Amino acid sequence: AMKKVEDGNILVFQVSMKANKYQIKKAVKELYEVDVLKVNTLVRPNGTKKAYVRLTADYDALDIANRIGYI
Amino acid sequence: AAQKSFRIKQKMAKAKKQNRPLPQWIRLRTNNTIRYNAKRRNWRRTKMNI
Amino acid sequence: KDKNILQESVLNKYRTAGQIAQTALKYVTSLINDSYHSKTTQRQLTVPELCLLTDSFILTRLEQYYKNKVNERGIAIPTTIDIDQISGGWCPEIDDVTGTLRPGDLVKITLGVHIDGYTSEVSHTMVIYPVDETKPILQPTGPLLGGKADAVAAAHIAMETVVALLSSGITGQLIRTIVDTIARSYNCGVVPGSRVRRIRRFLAGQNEGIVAEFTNVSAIPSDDFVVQSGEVYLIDLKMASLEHKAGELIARPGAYVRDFAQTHILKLKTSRQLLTKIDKQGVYPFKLSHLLKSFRLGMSEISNNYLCVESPIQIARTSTLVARECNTIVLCDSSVSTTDRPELLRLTGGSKTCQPSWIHSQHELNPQDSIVQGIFQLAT
Amino acid sequence: LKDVVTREYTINLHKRLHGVSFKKRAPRAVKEIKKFAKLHMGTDDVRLAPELNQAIWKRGVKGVEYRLRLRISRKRNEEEDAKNPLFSYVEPVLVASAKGLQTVVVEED
RNA sequence: CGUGGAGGUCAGUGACGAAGCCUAGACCGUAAGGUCGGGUCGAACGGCCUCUAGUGCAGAUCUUGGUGGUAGUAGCAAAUAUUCAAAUGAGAACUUUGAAGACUGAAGUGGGGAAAGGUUCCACGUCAACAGCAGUUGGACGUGGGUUAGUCGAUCCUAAGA
RNA sequence: UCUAAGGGUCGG
RNA sequence: UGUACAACGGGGUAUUGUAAGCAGUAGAGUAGCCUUGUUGUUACGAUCUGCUGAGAUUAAGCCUUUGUUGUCUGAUUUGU
């Protein structure tokens, strides 16, 4: 997932099972003050939902990755 | 099955998270009897029956 | 085996790096003033601007010497500014909480320069002052008193003792013992277990060391050793007004050095590339601020597998003070008028000296007591 | 003693393979050649060159040449001294026909 | 004669050793049995007068468990077939790499799917058990990683029927 | 190793 | 340490039926090219003839051997 941040302008999140691509994009758009290109999602085999959120080219996910504070 | 229902996959996920050895520190608990995960399961030894 | 084991040219490279270290240190001390005072002059001084200024000055000044020559020169130890009870290694990232100097703060500035791998390290302690134009003569016609004075005088007298004792023929243990005696004279304690290293070309951390105030275990694990002509040491005195048992307190480590003795094939491309970029650096220690996000992830795997050694930010108890003086000295045999005897040549210079009349303590080194006779003689 | 030689030998594989189950012929030729190396120069540790394996198996399981001209050199063992200090290394000799020849000391320089 | 429990009594025996168990050692009794020594053991137990029964085993193709002879025996023979070397390893017929020899022969021992399984997929570590020889190998053990859709499905439609 | 027979296209 | 033994090689005995290579005014013919044939040559051609009862195999439970080469004291028991 980290590689996706470094190389694909993608933030990766475990996200509510009950969410949806709209509801996820909105939350990402507001918790992080960033704009969003599209969200893909899948249901991981442990029963959680993971969301690939690609940011628009105005943003660098790696920047905003380590603003949030992981790496 | 591949195209599998959500109910089934859910049950499948739970059934997978239960599939681990006993956490070793339980053995250190006081008055502990549990030596090992006696309810443990394997795809090639016992089917789930859905 | 190096031919020549020592040369005039090597002494020159140490002296020139020392001149730079001394100049940069003094510049940073002059630039240290309260935040309010800095404001009156259209500037701001925090735990960040001074570190950035120091490092940039080291690079600029080293850039001006040995011009057009195939070599390496620059930072041997990144500018670190450790205030009050903070012991060492504070050099914040742009994203970390900065620290803004206050009037009366006790400040330790620690930095190192190298020229062709020959290292000149220095550190100095002082107390912050308002702008001279706003309070002309006030800070000067006053003295520092109390525990701040106690710990600063103790640390400087420990430095003076070490200058006299770190010479060919003496043992490292003699220094350790003297430091405890001097520090206790002021009801202070040298920080347990901290090391002063022999320096060699490209080597900031020689295995031959002087240890401060060792625990019983540290006494067993640490090697007794005799100083010899042609050796170089970065003597580092860190003394506390408290118990002297420095601890980590959750502060982010920013200073690291590559350890060429350790090898590991890293799993992540970011880590491998970070490793490669680090090995391009001259000095053993560097700050992560020299990279910020992509360094943070590369650091993780490298530090985990011991490829990078951290220089953690340690603290004494809140309200206590830690003072530091560090100087680099060149020990060697002087054959004069037929007699050969070891003499030490300090290269830190002006940067490492403090104005003794600024500090007034209730205490002094006592030579009458069975317990401090001889120390007074040594210091005079 | 133990004296490091190297001779050249023709083995009659035909009379040694006579009767053998077809799927076992090339395999026996391997065993039978070791047995030969052992017999000549009592070595016990017999290593076969892969070019000789190839030679042996060149017409597949069933079609072993009737004679092989072999090169067998007794040699010194190296490392964690396996039971015996000595070798035999066996390799093939590129010759026109294996018919006609007698065993020969190869002088070793 | 002997057993579980009950009322009464010996102010019964006992951690300085109760009960239990072992003993071609001893003694009493026609016998059912009783008693003693020695060894082992560790917390309770017995005699006498009574009371009471879920009260005494060799068998029931008895019940449950445990164990033998059989016996290191029958066997581990379908599906053409293996060989040389190096590497690794405490250890190599069986792992990996190389070479050779062969086979499946596209009606496949190739490449995908449906039902079904459910993580067996991939990586790192790794052999106690399991793979009816072996094992450093694995569909095994431990720890992790992994499934991205307006356009492929479900979803909509109607079928027998419900 | 030979023999013969069995088509196409385009110009009159 | 031999009138030894073995591995090879040699000779004999057998089996099969004439090896490879070369050569041929041997070969039904066809087709090219030329100086157009007292033997014209070039390509192709199953096969045929010679060297050639040749070549291959021959103890693995054949026989022999003036050659070549090598081998020749490891283990365990036993007494009236």
PDB file of N, CA and C in Angstrom, chain C residues 12-73:
ATOM      1  N   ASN C  12      46.962  20.503   9.880  1.00  0.00           N
ATOM      2  CA  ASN C  12      46.352  21.674   9.222  1.00  0.00           C
ATOM      3  C   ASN C  12      44.848  21.481   8.971  1.00  0.00           C
ATOM      4  N   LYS C  13      44.477  20.313   8.455  1.00  0.00           N
ATOM      5  CA  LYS C  13      43.071  20.011   8.187  1.00  0.00           C
ATOM      6  C   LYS C  13      42.235  20.027   9.476  1.00  0.00           C
ATOM      7  N   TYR C  14      42.773  19.476  10.566  1.00  0.00           N
ATOM      8  CA  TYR C  14      42.086  19.576  11.862  1.00  0.00           C
ATOM      9  C   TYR C  14      41.952  21.025  12.319  1.00  0.00           C
ATOM     10  N   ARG C  15      43.042  21.782  12.237  1.00  0.00           N
ATOM     11  CA  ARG C  15      43.034  23.184  12.692  1.00  0.00           C
ATOM     12  C   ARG C  15      42.043  24.020  11.880  1.00  0.00           C
ATOM     13  N   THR C  16      42.019  23.808  10.566  1.00  0.00           N
ATOM     14  CA  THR C  16      41.094  24.589   9.721  1.00  0.00           C
ATOM     15  C   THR C  16      39.638  24.228   9.996  1.00  0.00           C
ATOM     16  N   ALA C  17      39.349  22.945  10.213  1.00  0.00           N
ATOM     17  CA  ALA C  17      37.981  22.552  10.590  1.00  0.00           C
ATOM     18  C   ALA C  17      37.631  23.121  11.961  1.00  0.00           C
ATOM     19  N   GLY C  18      38.600  23.108  12.877  1.00  0.00           N
ATOM     20  CA  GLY C  18      38.410  23.710  14.217  1.00  0.00           C
ATOM     21  C   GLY C  18      38.107  25.201  14.168  1.00  0.00           C
ATOM     22  N   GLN C  19      38.833  25.919  13.301  1.00  0.00           N
ATOM     23  CA  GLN C  19      38.583  27.369  13.130  1.00  0.00           C
ATOM     24  C   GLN C  19      37.145  27.604  12.668  1.00  0.00           C
ATOM     25  N   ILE C  20      36.680  26.779  11.731  1.00  0.00           N
ATOM     26  CA  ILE C  20      35.303  26.900  11.240  1.00  0.00           C
ATOM     27  C   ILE C  20      34.290  26.575  12.352  1.00  0.00           C
ATOM     28  N   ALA C  21      34.523  25.473  13.067  1.00  0.00           N
ATOM     29  CA  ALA C  21      33.613  25.079  14.158  1.00  0.00           C
ATOM     30  C   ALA C  21      33.517  26.206  15.185  1.00  0.00           C
ATOM     31  N   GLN C  22      34.669  26.774  15.537  1.00  0.00           N
ATOM     32  CA  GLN C  22      34.719  27.862  16.532  1.00  0.00           C
ATOM     33  C   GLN C  22      33.951  29.097  16.072  1.00  0.00           C
ATOM     34  N   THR C  23      34.103  29.423  14.796  1.00  0.00           N
ATOM     35  CA  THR C  23      33.468  30.610  14.234  1.00  0.00           C
ATOM     36  C   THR C  23      31.955  30.431  14.153  1.00  0.00           C
ATOM     37  N   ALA C  24      31.537  29.274  13.665  1.00  0.00           N
ATOM     38  CA  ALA C  24      30.110  29.002  13.543  1.00  0.00           C
ATOM     39  C   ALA C  24      29.466  28.978  14.941  1.00  0.00           C
ATOM     40  N   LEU C  25      30.102  28.295  15.892  1.00  0.00           N
ATOM     41  CA  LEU C  25      29.570  28.263  17.265  1.00  0.00           C
ATOM     42  C   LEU C  25      29.372  29.676  17.810  1.00  0.00           C
ATOM     43  N   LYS C  26      30.405  30.513  17.672  1.00  0.00           N
ATOM     44  CA  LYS C  26      30.323  31.884  18.210  1.00  0.00           C
ATOM     45  C   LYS C  26      29.220  32.694  17.529  1.00  0.00           C
ATOM     46  N   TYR C  27      29.043  32.490  16.221  1.00  0.00           N
ATOM     47  CA  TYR C  27      27.963  33.147  15.472  1.00  0.00           C
ATOM     48  C   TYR C  27      26.601  32.756  16.036  1.00  0.00           C
ATOM     49  N   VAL C  28      26.447  31.465  16.332  1.00  0.00           N
ATOM     50  CA  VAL C  28      25.171  30.961  16.826  1.00  0.00           C
ATOM     51  C   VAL C  28      24.887  31.478  18.232  1.00  0.00           C
ATOM     52  N   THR C  29      25.915  31.538  19.073  1.00  0.00           N
ATOM     53  CA  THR C  29      25.765  32.099  20.427  1.00  0.00           C
ATOM     54  C   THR C  29      25.297  33.576  20.337  1.00  0.00           C
ATOM     55  N   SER C  30      25.945  34.363  19.472  1.00  0.00           N
ATOM     56  CA  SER C  30      25.553  35.779  19.267  1.00  0.00           C
ATOM     57  C   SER C  30      24.098  35.881  18.763  1.00  0.00           C
ATOM     58  N   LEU C  31      23.665  34.919  17.938  1.00  0.00           N
ATOM     59  CA  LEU C  31      22.309  34.940  17.348  1.00  0.00           C
ATOM     60  C   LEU C  31      21.208  34.454  18.304  1.00  0.00           C
ATOM     61  N   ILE C  32      21.646  33.913  19.432  1.00  0.00           N
ATOM     62  CA  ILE C  32      20.748  33.435  20.444  1.00  0.00           C
ATOM     63  C   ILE C  32      20.293  34.629  21.260  1.00  0.00           C
ATOM     64  N   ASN C  33      19.009  34.879  21.156  1.00  0.00           N
ATOM     65  CA  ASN C  33      18.352  35.795  22.090  1.00  0.00           C
ATOM     66  C   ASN C  33      16.904  35.384  22.279  1.00  0.00           C
ATOM     67  N   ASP C  34      16.226  36.003  23.243  1.00  0.00           N
ATOM     68  CA  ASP C  34      14.833  35.678  23.502  1.00  0.00           C
ATOM     69  C   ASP C  34      14.023  35.802  22.216  1.00  0.00           C
ATOM     70  N   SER C  35      12.820  35.236  22.205  1.00  0.00           N
ATOM     71  CA  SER C  35      11.966  35.323  21.023  1.00  0.00           C
ATOM     72  C   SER C  35      11.462  36.744  20.869  1.00  0.00           C
ATOM     73  N   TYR C  36      11.155  37.383  21.994  1.00  0.00           N
ATOM     74  CA  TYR C  36      10.656  38.755  21.986  1.00  0.00           C
ATOM     75  C   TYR C  36      11.756  39.684  21.500  1.00  0.00           C
ATOM     76  N   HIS C  37      12.969  39.441  21.968  1.00  0.00           N
ATOM     77  CA  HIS C  37      14.099  40.257  21.573  1.00  0.00           C
ATOM     78  C   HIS C  37      14.391  40.112  20.084  1.00  0.00           C
ATOM     79  N   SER C  38      14.293  38.888  19.582  1.00  0.00           N
ATOM     80  CA  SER C  38      14.532  38.643  18.165  1.00  0.00           C
ATOM     81  C   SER C  38      13.489  39.420  17.373  1.00  0.00           C
ATOM     82  N   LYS C  39      12.285  39.485  17.930  1.00  0.00           N
ATOM     83  CA  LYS C  39      11.174  40.181  17.299  1.00  0.00           C
ATOM     84  C   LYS C  39      11.442  41.677  17.145  1.00  0.00           C
ATOM     85  N   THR C  40      12.088  42.286  18.141  1.00  0.00           N
ATOM     86  CA  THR C  40      12.378  43.716  18.077  1.00  0.00           C
ATOM     87  C   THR C  40      13.333  43.997  16.929  1.00  0.00           C
ATOM     88  N   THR C  41      14.059  42.975  16.497  1.00  0.00           N
ATOM     89  CA  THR C  41      15.017  43.150  15.415  1.00  0.00           C
ATOM     90  C   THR C  41      14.585  42.550  14.082  1.00  0.00           C
ATOM     91  N   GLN C  42      13.286  42.310  13.944  1.00  0.00           N
ATOM     92  CA  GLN C  42      12.756  41.763  12.705  1.00  0.00           C
ATOM     93  C   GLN C  42      13.181  40.347  12.381  1.00  0.00           C
ATOM     94  N   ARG C  43      13.413  39.549  13.417  1.00  0.00           N
ATOM     95  CA  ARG C  43      13.826  38.161  13.245  1.00  0.00           C
ATOM     96  C   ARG C  43      13.168  37.290  14.302  1.00  0.00           C
ATOM     97  N   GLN C  44      13.249  35.981  14.114  1.00  0.00           N
ATOM     98  CA  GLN C  44      12.711  35.043  15.081  1.00  0.00           C
ATOM     99  C   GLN C  44      13.771  33.958  15.270  1.00  0.00           C
ATOM    100  N   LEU C  45      13.928  33.523  16.508  1.00  0.00           N
ATOM    101  CA  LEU C  45      14.905  32.504  16.832  1.00  0.00           C
ATOM    102  C   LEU C  45      14.219  31.360  17.538  1.00  0.00           C
ATOM    103  N   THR C  46      14.297  30.178  16.940  1.00  0.00           N
ATOM    104  CA  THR C  46      13.695  28.993  17.519  1.00  0.00           C
ATOM    105  C   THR C  46      14.729  27.885  17.487  1.00  0.00           C
ATOM    106  N   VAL C  47      14.327  26.708  17.951  1.00  0.00           N
ATOM    107  CA  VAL C  47      15.207  25.555  17.968  1.00  0.00           C
ATOM    108  C   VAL C  47      15.453  25.054  16.542  1.00  0.00           C
ATOM    109  N   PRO C  48      14.931  25.869  15.562  1.00  0.00           N
ATOM    110  CA  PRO C  48      15.029  25.373  14.177  1.00  0.00           C
ATOM    111  C   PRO C  48      15.882  26.311  13.317  1.00  0.00           C
ATOM    112  N   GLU C  49      15.636  27.623  13.434  1.00  0.00           N
ATOM    113  CA  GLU C  49      16.338  28.595  12.610  1.00  0.00           C
ATOM    114  C   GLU C  49      17.841  28.559  12.907  1.00  0.00           C
ATOM    115  N   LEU C  50      18.196  28.430  14.193  1.00  0.00           N
ATOM    116  CA  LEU C  50      19.602  28.356  14.573  1.00  0.00           C
ATOM    117  C   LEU C  50      20.251  27.076  14.044  1.00  0.00           C
ATOM    118  N   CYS C  51      19.525  25.962  14.103  1.00  0.00           N
ATOM    119  CA  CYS C  51      20.108  24.717  13.589  1.00  0.00           C
ATOM    120  C   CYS C  51      20.363  24.823  12.089  1.00  0.00           C
ATOM    121  N   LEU C  52      19.375  25.346  11.364  1.00  0.00           N
ATOM    122  CA  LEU C  52      19.516  25.555   9.920  1.00  0.00           C
ATOM    123  C   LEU C  52      20.639  26.535   9.570  1.00  0.00           C
ATOM    124  N   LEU C  53      20.720  27.626  10.335  1.00  0.00           N
ATOM    125  CA  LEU C  53      21.782  28.625  10.150  1.00  0.00           C
ATOM    126  C   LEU C  53      23.167  27.992  10.361  1.00  0.00           C
ATOM    127  N   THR C  54      23.328  27.272  11.472  1.00  0.00           N
ATOM    128  CA  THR C  54      24.615  26.587  11.769  1.00  0.00           C
ATOM    129  C   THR C  54      25.050  25.664  10.654  1.00  0.00           C
ATOM    130  N   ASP C  55      24.142  24.799  10.224  1.00  0.00           N
ATOM    131  CA  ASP C  55      24.520  23.816   9.205  1.00  0.00           C
ATOM    132  C   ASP C  55      24.897  24.510   7.905  1.00  0.00           C
ATOM    133  N   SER C  56      24.108  25.519   7.521  1.00  0.00           N
ATOM    134  CA  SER C  56      24.391  26.238   6.283  1.00  0.00           C
ATOM    135  C   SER C  56      25.747  26.947   6.339  1.00  0.00           C
ATOM    136  N   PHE C  57      26.082  27.493   7.510  1.00  0.00           N
ATOM    137  CA  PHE C  57      27.349  28.188   7.672  1.00  0.00           C
ATOM    138  C   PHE C  57      28.512  27.204   7.586  1.00  0.00           C
ATOM    139  N   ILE C  58      28.325  26.019   8.161  1.00  0.00           N
ATOM    140  CA  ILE C  58      29.374  24.975   8.060  1.00  0.00           C
ATOM    141  C   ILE C  58      29.624  24.635   6.591  1.00  0.00           C
ATOM    142  N   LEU C  59      28.549  24.435   5.821  1.00  0.00           N
ATOM    143  CA  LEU C  59      28.709  24.086   4.393  1.00  0.00           C
ATOM    144  C   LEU C  59      29.353  25.240   3.614  1.00  0.00           C
ATOM    145  N   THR C  60      28.946  26.474   3.905  1.00  0.00           N
ATOM    146  CA  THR C  60      29.496  27.631   3.183  1.00  0.00           C
ATOM    147  C   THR C  60      30.994  27.827   3.472  1.00  0.00           C
ATOM    148  N   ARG C  61      31.368  27.663   4.741  1.00  0.00           N
ATOM    149  CA  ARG C  61      32.732  27.921   5.158  1.00  0.00           C
ATOM    150  C   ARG C  61      33.657  26.816   4.689  1.00  0.00           C
ATOM    151  N   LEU C  62      33.218  25.562   4.791  1.00  0.00           N
ATOM    152  CA  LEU C  62      34.022  24.448   4.263  1.00  0.00           C
ATOM    153  C   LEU C  62      34.121  24.552   2.738  1.00  0.00           C
ATOM    154  N   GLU C  63      33.081  25.086   2.101  1.00  0.00           N
ATOM    155  CA  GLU C  63      33.112  25.267   0.639  1.00  0.00           C
ATOM    156  C   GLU C  63      34.203  26.214   0.145  1.00  0.00           C
ATOM    157  N   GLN C  64      34.671  27.093   1.029  1.00  0.00           N
ATOM    158  CA  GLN C  64      35.618  28.158   0.702  1.00  0.00           C
ATOM    159  C   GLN C  64      37.080  27.755   0.881  1.00  0.00           C
ATOM    160  N   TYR C  65      37.325  26.574   1.445  1.00  0.00           N
ATOM    161  CA  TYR C  65      38.699  26.110   1.669  1.00  0.00           C
ATOM    162  C   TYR C  65      38.997  24.879   0.816  1.00  0.00           C
ATOM    163  N   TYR C  66      40.283  24.626   0.567  1.00  0.00           N
ATOM    164  CA  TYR C  66      40.693  23.524  -0.316  1.00  0.00           C
ATOM    165  C   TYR C  66      39.905  23.505  -1.639  1.00  0.00           C
ATOM    166  N   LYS C  67      39.675  24.703  -2.182  1.00  0.00           N
ATOM    167  CA  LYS C  67      38.877  24.870  -3.394  1.00  0.00           C
ATOM    168  C   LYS C  67      39.482  24.179  -4.616  1.00  0.00           C
ATOM    169  N   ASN C  68      38.628  23.568  -5.434  1.00  0.00           N
ATOM    170  CA  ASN C  68      39.096  22.887  -6.630  1.00  0.00           C
ATOM    171  C   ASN C  68      39.886  21.615  -6.376  1.00  0.00           C
ATOM    172  N   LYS C  69      39.796  21.078  -5.160  1.00  0.00           N
ATOM    173  CA  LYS C  69      40.517  19.861  -4.798  1.00  0.00           C
ATOM    174  C   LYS C  69      39.554  18.675  -4.642  1.00  0.00           C
ATOM    175  N   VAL C  70      39.984  17.492  -5.080  1.00  0.00           N
ATOM    176  CA  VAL C  70      39.154  16.299  -4.987  1.00  0.00           C
ATOM    177  C   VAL C  70      39.121  15.836  -3.537  1.00  0.00           C
ATOM    178  N   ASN C  71      38.049  16.179  -2.834  1.00  0.00           N
ATOM    179  CA  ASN C  71      37.910  15.821  -1.429  1.00  0.00           C
ATOM    180  C   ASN C  71      36.487  16.054  -0.958  1.00  0.00           C
ATOM    181  N   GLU C  72      36.211  15.763   0.215  1.00  0.00           N
ATOM    182  CA  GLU C  72      34.976  15.855   1.000  1.00  0.00           C
ATOM    183  C   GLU C  72      35.220  16.700   2.235  1.00  0.00           C
ATOM    184  N   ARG C  73      34.207  17.469   2.614  1.00  0.00           N
ATOM    185  CA  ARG C  73      34.298  18.402   3.741  1.00  0.00           C
ATOM    186  C   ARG C  73      32.885  18.895   4.025  1.00  0.00           C
TER     187      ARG C  73
END
